[PDB]
Each structure stands twice: as structure tokens, then as C-alpha cells.
Amino acid sequence: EVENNFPCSLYKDEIMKEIERESKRIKLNDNDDEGNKKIIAPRIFISDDKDSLKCPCDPEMVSNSTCRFFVCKCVERRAEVTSNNEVVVKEEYKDEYADIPEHKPTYDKM
Structure with a gap:
């Protein structure tokens, strides 16, 4: 089977999205302390290119x-x-x- 929407940039090279899991990124939780560096992406890609724009x-x-x-x-x-x-x-x-x-003189300044 083949998907109709074929990501051009995603198939061309790596993505500037610097993501390990899916196409999202780590949630803006700030606090979680789940070890050291937790990186879980809960959202899929929507653009064939995410590097050209250089701004998500x-x-x-x-x-x-x-x-x-x-x-x-x-x-x-x-x-x-x-x-x-x-x-x-x-x-x-x-x-x-x-x-x-x-x-x-003595201790001046302040």
C-alpha cells in the first residue's frame, strides 16, 4: 500500500524538527522529572517540508x-x-x- 500524500522534504533528507518519536515534540510541561531527557512527540506531520520555512x-x-x-x-x-x-x-x-x-579613608563606597 502507498499513501497519496508523499512528504517531499521528509523523503529528501532529515527534518529540522529535531524529533525522536513522532513529528511533534516534547510537551510544554516544564515539570515532569521523568529521568533526564524525556522526548515524546504526540502529533503527526502535516507538512511535506518543515525545514524550508525554518519556523514552525x-x-x-x-x-x-x-x-x-x-x-x-x-x-x-x-x-x-x-x-x-x-x-x-x-x-x-x-x-x-x-x-x-x-x-x-576607611570603608567608603556605601
């Missing part, structure tokens, strides 16, 4: 030529965390130095 987020359908590829589409470009809006240019003072500036 959102299942878009790209037919290309004849295969059904579920490509990433949950990211517009790149979700980067903002860490600079209108920060005033300044210089971070040096904590200490590997030298002796002067005599100094």
Missing part, C-alpha cells in the same frame, strides 16, 4: 510546485524586545581600577 509557527500552505508545505506566518519580520526609546547619551562610570589612586 503558524501553518501557512505553500504548494510550491506539487507539495504542501506548512510555512511560518506568525512573524511579520522579527520580534525584538525594545531596549532603547529615547535614552540620553551618557557614559557608565568605572566601578574600580587595578591601581591605588591615593591613601583614602
